[PDB]
């Protein structure tokens, strides 16, 4: 994947921040079915161009969504106003090269992404709460017809006077699993719309039933 979008030979173009709308099922011309995800880009715009000259690093501050003065907390109302930039639901920074540097106040959209090529998403995933092992890590469990008060628990660290009561950094039942996990080197974008600025992807994009995803690798 090269010679597309808008840049020179080699750089990283900025990322674009969208919302997981759901999944559906398309078909191809060769009569085969692929699952589909629709990522909705809410008129994302540039709100701060970060600078090695002044600040120290090369970053485009893309805002997404829409918000209202009754919903922002004044310390950011001031930010948006000083930038003179329409209000957005969530901010997000990207580090991109010296080229691929945008003017304050240029909106982005899905035609930034050439179809047929790949992306990398980052979606703060769907935690499940204070789960335990055997689901958190796919541990096994002792039988259900012989052993008591263990039917679903775990084992015990290596342990004896040597490795003296020193459980190394092991694997225990633990709190939730909501985090940001990329799906590296995604599979090509089916289609993106001129209006409505959606985009369909072959499937399995992390993030909630809405409100969370980022995209890069292009």
């Amino acid at each position: 994947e090269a010679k597309q979008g808008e840049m020179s030979s080699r750089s990283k173009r900025t990322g674009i921040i969208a919302v997981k709308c759901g999944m559906t099922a398309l078909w191809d011309k060769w009569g085969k079915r692929i699952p589909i995800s629709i990522l909705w880009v809410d008129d994302n715009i540039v709100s701060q161009v970060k600078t090695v000259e002044k600040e120290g690093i090369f970053a485009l501050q893309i805002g997404c969504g829409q918000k209202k003065p009754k919903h922002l907390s004044k310390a950011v109302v001031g930010h948006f106003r000083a930038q003179g930039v329409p209000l957005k639901r969530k901010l997000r920074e990207f580090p991109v090269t010296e080229d691929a540097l945008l003017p304050v106040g240029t909106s982005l959209g899905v035609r930034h992404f050439v179809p047929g090529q790949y992306v990398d998403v980052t979606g703060i995933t769907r935690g499940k709460g204070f789960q335990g092992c055997m689901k958190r890590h796919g541990f096994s469990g002792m039988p259900a017809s012989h052993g008591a008060s263990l039917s679903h628990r775990s084992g015990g660290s290596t342990g004896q006077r040597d490795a003296p009561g020193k459980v190394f950094k092991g694997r225990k039942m633990a709190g939730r699993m909501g985090a940001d996990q990329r799906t590296v080197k995604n599979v090509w974008v089916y289609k993106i719309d001129p209006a409505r600025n959606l985009m369909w992807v072959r499937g399995q994009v992390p993030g909630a039933e809405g409100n969370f995803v980022f995209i890069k690798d292009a």
Binding site: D42, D43, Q66, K67, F80, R81
Partner: protein, 141 residues
Amino acid sequence: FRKLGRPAGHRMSMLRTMVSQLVKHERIETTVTKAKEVRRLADNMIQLGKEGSLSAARRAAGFVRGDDVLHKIFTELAHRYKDRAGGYTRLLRTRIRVGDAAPMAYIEFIDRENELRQSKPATPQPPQRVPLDPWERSRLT
């Protein structure tokens, strides 16, 4: 959504008594996170007073009980909300005191003699319109 921590038979057979008493009397003082639950059966038993047919009456015969609060509904609550489209209870949070830190709540109907928060007037709904998705409100400042 609430379980209240009760076997799903006993839970109903309590909620029935609660809505029925809420209709016999006009106000009750109950634990809030359970008032937040009769908040639904009361209205779905007002709707049957509004419909009043034989079908939607013999159905209410199952959900309300104790006394002829059945007739109380059908006769007065209809005629006092023949217009009010939705929202037939107030569910205020009195937290009076208990000995168990359990909150407490007044729950009672709306257009009576002495209500608690002197209501707004029952206005008929406006009729539906087609939804659109412009997403054109910049909200800049």
